[PDB]
Design a protein around this nucleic acid. Structure first.
Ligand code: MG
Ligand code: MG
Ligand code: MG
Ligand code: MG
Ligand code: MG
Ligand code: MG
Ligand code: MG
Ligand code: MG
Ligand code: MG
Ligand code: MG
Ligand code: MG
Ligand code: MG
Ligand code: MG
Ligand code: MG
Lengths: 213, 75, 175, 168, 159
RNA sequence: UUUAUCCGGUAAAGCGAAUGAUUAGAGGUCUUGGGGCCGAAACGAUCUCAACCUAUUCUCAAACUUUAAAUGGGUAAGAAGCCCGGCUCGCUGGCGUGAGCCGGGCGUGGAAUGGAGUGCCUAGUGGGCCACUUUUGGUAAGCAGAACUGGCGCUGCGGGAUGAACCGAACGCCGGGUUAAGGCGCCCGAUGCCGACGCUCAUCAGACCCCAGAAAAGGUGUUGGUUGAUAUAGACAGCAGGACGGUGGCCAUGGAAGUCGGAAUCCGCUAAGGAGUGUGUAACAACUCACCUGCCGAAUCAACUAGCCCUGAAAAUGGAUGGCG
RNA sequence: ACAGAAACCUCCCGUGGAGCAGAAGGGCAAAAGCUCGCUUGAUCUUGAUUUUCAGUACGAAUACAGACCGUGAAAGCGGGG
RNA sequence: CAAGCGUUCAUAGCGACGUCGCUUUUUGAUCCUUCGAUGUCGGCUCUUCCUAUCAUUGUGAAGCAGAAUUCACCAAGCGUUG
RNA sequence: GUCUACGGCCAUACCACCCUGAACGCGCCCGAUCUCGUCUGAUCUCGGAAGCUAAGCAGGGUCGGGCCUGGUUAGUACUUGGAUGGGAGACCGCCUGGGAAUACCGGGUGCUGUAGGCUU
């Protein structure tokens, strides 16, 4: 199946992205990077819970798979099938290699050892830096503890270590949460489904004329 | 019977033991390499400097006696 | 950075004048170090973290010791902290009950070493501040903290165990 | 406030020996004339000089000498380079015999040009043969690390005089 | 092993910089060079005739020859030690006037001037350059404020 | 090394900048579709999914790049240089250019160091190895392969118990002094400091760069913090009373009247009782827990975080912080 | 008009997203691309230099000079691509 | 870690998706040692040692009533055949 | 103030739209006899001078896109040297020096060269 994540834990070799230069890559295991009610609004989910890495390491595609599922399962739960949104923010992008298992039959007669040591693609892997986010969840301010425990269970599908952190942003935006309501009325910010559009004092005046009209 | 394939390992030491020498440049370097139509002319300029040495010699005494007069008028 | 007995070398310094701004501001920090040369150097470590200023583009104006105004009167020092543990970096408040601000953080540097194995290069002193009787949270300091203070010295071991290295009388430990 | 003058004179000692030393390091240290371990020279502080001490800082220990430190070095351990010889400065007819063309005539006139850096520091501090100082009585702190982290290397403003007592 | 090809690895060197692909500006072939003048070679992709070779790209050298649209030029090229003063033929599009020379000849025109004058006086002027000296003790004056107190700020995990 | 001055496409960064990947929604019959559902059909309505694109957003690139370092590579810092005067030309041209010559006129041109230049013969070598950092294969190697410097080979000495290569330091033969890296209970020179301040007790203690041993995960073992709690309107804990009524509530009946499970789902007595934490009972009951009381008199509680010690922790001639301890 | 996602014609937009015999990489717009007319600089001849480098060859290339020409009003360009 | 199996019930016994290790009784990789040769498979015999315990002593667990049986702990004393 | 001819540096000059152009010129414009070229006097070549600023061009305008420059991001990312620093390791801290890039905020929007006009 696959070597234990031990061997592909450290970022040794330069990124090997899937391109015309390596082909035949087995399709990444994890597929769906966000679930829950991705049809939510910004105005009804103010809790940016994060799971932040603390080590410069790799994350296997199949790990991001279980870490998502086991968080979907302590969520829809205490929260309910509508009361959250889960984001995976690491797309397995760098291709991991395997010298061809040094396959032999019986005892052996020959393997060539190391001639053409360069190996095949085996799977995919995410590159993670210190202080870079892996998963992020958003719910109501009511439901804080259940974001903490759902991310606390996903830590156990990951190598290394990672701190759980609750953000000062509003949901998934980049805007400090003490300021949202102020920048919504007077329209420094305009609801755009999940995200939100920052409208500056830059463009044509008619672009304003739509707002404050 | 595999072997090392290359290295520049202590080479910096070797060619700096006698201290890499910027090429010693003299005045009057060689004209070899200059385009022939230059030389084919400048050799005629050099070959007939003498025809016209009388002008040069008398006109030298003119300024030599005018500046022997210029340094004596200062005196 | 290393230690000794720490001292309160306060420093001020400006970013030396360019043609555009001719009178830059002055900054005094309460740097806290064993002599001049390192008290100058701990300055540029803290001003480079706060201002866009370097040892090249600046100059120290005044370096001089500030020495305790009440050295014969015991005081309660709280001191806010920030160090670097093996995992992250954490903030603290700790209390020490000695009678000189310098010695009070000489004690603190000894504890982060003793209780957290944090060497001096990891620690940052936010601000030392002497406190009144109340406002003291640590009961390790809060216990002396009275009038009719009273101990015996119960199990008083003898040093001088190598003055006479051989003796007839077994020692005593009660006094 | 007052900002005293940037020191113009700094007396540099080498504090680590000679093996396992970088290429660029080894060139500087033979321009400061700190060839053998543990000797010292008066370098004149200057944008180019200062930027040569930065580059050999893990090897040296320099600082701003005071007057008594200048005397001690020049008298007790002061030898003059005459005819490419380390000749002891026993009488001052040896100093005038080399430096008389600069108004320097005596043991005391040398010290002017060494303290108040002066017009002739180039010839004064190049007829002085590098001072060969003993080991530091009492020991160093850490030959490897820099002064600021409890070591011995690099610059120590004005604290170098304690290092010149125990090393004369 | 790698290939000896004349233009290997120049993928990024001879490339016209950005938003400049096109007609060579006509100034670059209407400034004059005469023997002795110092020149810094800098290749260029658009003109391929008369290109230099990548080991001279970035190097300076004096001029010794001038043909109709090229310039013979002597540079130094270091090879495993011994430096060889070798002369190459480079069309003008890959050449500039190096102002490296021109700081001096302006210190010269000024030195020669400041010596002819102040000679009728006899007052000796500082002709030599001199490196940046110690910064010359001064005063600082705060007027009516004490300095601003700086404190290292308490850490908090941003993310 | 400064002072000028060119050269650079790596780290980083960016992808709302090209190229290449790629997530999400909002926006769009853009186009169009393939299924639908309501339509005979209808850009009709409502969906849907596909592909595109209008503002956005998540994440990437060694063989991508708007940007863009650090270290680094060139030159230049004068006498072979400037400034005048004049001759020569088969080149160049409306004249002049340009170069070449002769003749005069003028000196320390950044810091620091050191005597420089040049020619002959020529031995040995052409298996290399290691370490910091960078880095290519490989899962990894005391593996294979590069860069940069340093070593070892070619080289002893002090130190690391022992030891090519680590740390100090490079050896003419000696007397005195003093150090470096290391040390200073005993082996074993040196603490036979009246040394500071703490931490930890191990039925597997711990005990020093290379180096020779351990992980996730735990642990009211103890010590510090961090944050949030609770409280003289008397808590916490302990010992006493209730924990009900509207109510076999509703779904589910196979039994769920509170309780295998779920939509839920609030009032009355209120002091307080959740249409219920569980024990269980086919279901209750009975018991209990939230919740609230009775008694007591002041600090208590919870989640995290880190230090040390414990768990995790299993190998073979007896046994190795060098030993003793 | 027959004519449909594709024939042909016309306008508008079009920094290159095409093309430049081939691998890629650079370079290219009243061009180096495409279409025409005229052609043989793919010719004869010394040297100098670059590239691999020992700073030897071979190959390939870069500037010139001397002839004979091609082309264009011409400046120029051209001794294979 | 825990989604699940176990009538009910995560953890009696189990345990997916993941993840951290030990081990040198497997095979590999590698080529440091030996090519002026270390006798290169098994079986026979004989000793000793390890515990990653199959039995027996003492025990805690069970979806342990008894019987039987799995799970675990101190444990290598003595066994382990024709 | 401005244009025309030939330009240099090549967006502070571009692009999109909006408004105003006195006189000289630039242009649109009117013809195909000759010169020349086309399937076509559409372009090119030529002979013109009846009209008009409709457009190019010039000049402005836009909380305009772009570019040009500053600020911030940030002494952050990264890095030259250094340690018998930390950490099982990944990596991380400090000392000695150098020091970026977006998003986000500001400001600017062609400078001139020679020769000739016009505003006499
Ligand atoms: Mg050494
Ligand atoms: Mg070292
Ligand atoms: Mg490159
Ligand atoms: Mg051999
Ligand atoms: Mg010819
Ligand atoms: Mg062609
Ligand atoms: Mg079940
Ligand atoms: Mg080998
Ligand atoms: Mg034998
Ligand atoms: Mg056991
Ligand atoms: Mg017409
Ligand atoms: Mg118009
Ligand atoms: Mg108009
Ligand atoms: Mg704009």
């Amino acid at each position: 199946g696959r070597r234990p994540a031990r061997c592909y834990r450290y970022c040794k070799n330069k990124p090997y992205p899937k391109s015309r230069f390596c082909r035949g890559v087995p399709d990444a295991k994890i597929r769906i990077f966000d679930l829950g009610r991705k049809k939510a609004k910004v105005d009804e989910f103010p809790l940016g819970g994060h799971m932040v890495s603390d080590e410069y390491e790799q994350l296997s595609s199949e790990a991001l798979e279980a870490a998502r599922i086991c968080a979907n399962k302590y969520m829809v739960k205490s929260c309910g099938r509508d009361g959250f949104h889960m984001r995976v923010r690491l797309h397995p992008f760098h291709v991991i290699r395997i010298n061809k298992m040094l396959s032999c039959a019986g005892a052996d007669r020959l393997q060539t050892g190391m001639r053409g040591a360069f190996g095949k693609p085996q799977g995919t892997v995410a590159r993670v830096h210190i202080g870079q986010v892996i998963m992020s969840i958003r719910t109501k301010l009511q439901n804080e503890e259940h974001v903490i425990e759902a991310l606390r269970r996903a830590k156990f599908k990951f190598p290394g270590r990672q701190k759980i952190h609750i953000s000062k942003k509003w949901g998934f935006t980049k805007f400090n949460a003490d300021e949202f309501e102020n920048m919504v009325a007077k329209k420094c910010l305009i609801p755009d489904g999940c995200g939100v559009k920052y409208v500056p004092n830059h463009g044509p005046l008619d672009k304003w004329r739509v707002l404050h009209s | 019977a595999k072997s090392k394939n290359h290295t520049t390992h202590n080479q910096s030491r070797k060619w700096h033991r006698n201290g890499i020498k910027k090429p010693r440049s003299q005045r009057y370097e060689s004209l070899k390499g200059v385009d022939p139509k230059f030389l084919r002319n400048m050799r005629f300029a050099k070959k007939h400097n003498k025809k016209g040495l009388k002008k040069m010699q008398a006109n030298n005494a003119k300024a030599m006696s005018a500046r022997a007069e210029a340094i004596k008028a200062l005196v | 950075k290393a230690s000794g007995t720490l001292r309160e070398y306060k420093v001020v310094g400006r970013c030396l004048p360019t043609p555009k701004c001719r009178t830059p501001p002055l900054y005094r920090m309460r740097i806290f170090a064993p002599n001049h040369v390192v008290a100058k150097s701990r300055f540029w470590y803290f001003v480079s973290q706060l201002k866009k200023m370097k040892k090249s583009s600046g100059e120290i104006v005044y370096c001089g010791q500030v020495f305790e105004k009440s050295p014969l009167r015991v005081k309660n020092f709280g001191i806010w902290l920030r160090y670097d543990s093996r995992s992250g970096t954490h903030n603290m408040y700790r209390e020490y009950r000695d009678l000189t601000t310098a010695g009070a953080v000489t004690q603190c540097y000894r504890d982060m070493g003793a209780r957290h194995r944090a060497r001096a290069h990891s620690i940052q002193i936010m601000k030392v501040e002497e406190i009144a009787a109340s406002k003291c949270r640590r009961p390790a300091v809060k216990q002396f903290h009275d009038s009719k203070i009273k101990f015996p010295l119960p199990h008083r071991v003898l040093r001088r165990q190598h003055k006479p290295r051989f003796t007839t009388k077994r020692p005593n430990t009660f006094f | 406030f007052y900002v005293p003058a940037e020191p113009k004179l700094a007396f540099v000692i080498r504090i680590r020996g000679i093996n396992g030393v970088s290429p660029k390091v080894r060139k500087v240290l033979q321009l400061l004339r700190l060839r053998q371990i543990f000797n010292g020279t008066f370098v004149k502080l200057n944008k180019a000089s200062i930027n040569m001490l930065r580059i050999v800082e893990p090897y040296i220990a320099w600082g701003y000498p005071n007057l008594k430190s200048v005397n001690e070095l020049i008298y007790k351990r002061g030898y003059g380079k005459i005819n490419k010889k380390r000749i002891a400065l026993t009488d001052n007819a040896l100093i005038a015999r080399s430096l008389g063309k600069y108004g320097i005539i005596c043991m005391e006139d040398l010290i002017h040009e060494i303290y108040t850096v002066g017009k002739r520091f180039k010839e004064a501090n190049n007829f002085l043969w590098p001072f060969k100082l003993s080991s530091p009585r009492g020991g160093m702190k850490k030959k490897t690390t820099h002064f600021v982290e409890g070591g011995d290397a690099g610059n120590r403003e004005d604290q170098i005089n304690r290092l010149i007592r125990r090393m004369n | 092993t790698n290939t000896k090809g004349k233009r290997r690895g120049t993928r990024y060197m001879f490339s016209r910089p950005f938003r400049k692909h096109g007609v060579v500006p006509l100034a670059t072939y209407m400034r004059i060079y005469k023997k002795g003048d110092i020149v810094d070679i800098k290749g260029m992709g658009t003109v391929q005739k008369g290109m230099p070779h990548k080991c001279y790209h970035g190097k300076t050298g004096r001029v010794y020859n001038v043909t109709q649209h090229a310039v013979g030029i002597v540079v130094n090229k270091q090879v495993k030690g011994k430096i060889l003063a070798k002369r190459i033929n480079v069309r003008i599009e890959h050449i500039k006037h190096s102002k490296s020379r021109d700081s001096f000849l302006k210190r010269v025109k000024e030195n020669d001037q400041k010596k002819k004058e102040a000679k009728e006086k006899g007052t000796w002027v500082q002709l030599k350059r001199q490196p940046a000296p110690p910064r010359e003790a001064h005063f600082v004056r705060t007027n009516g404020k004490e300095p601003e107190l700086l404190e290292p700020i308490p850490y908090e995990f941003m993310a």
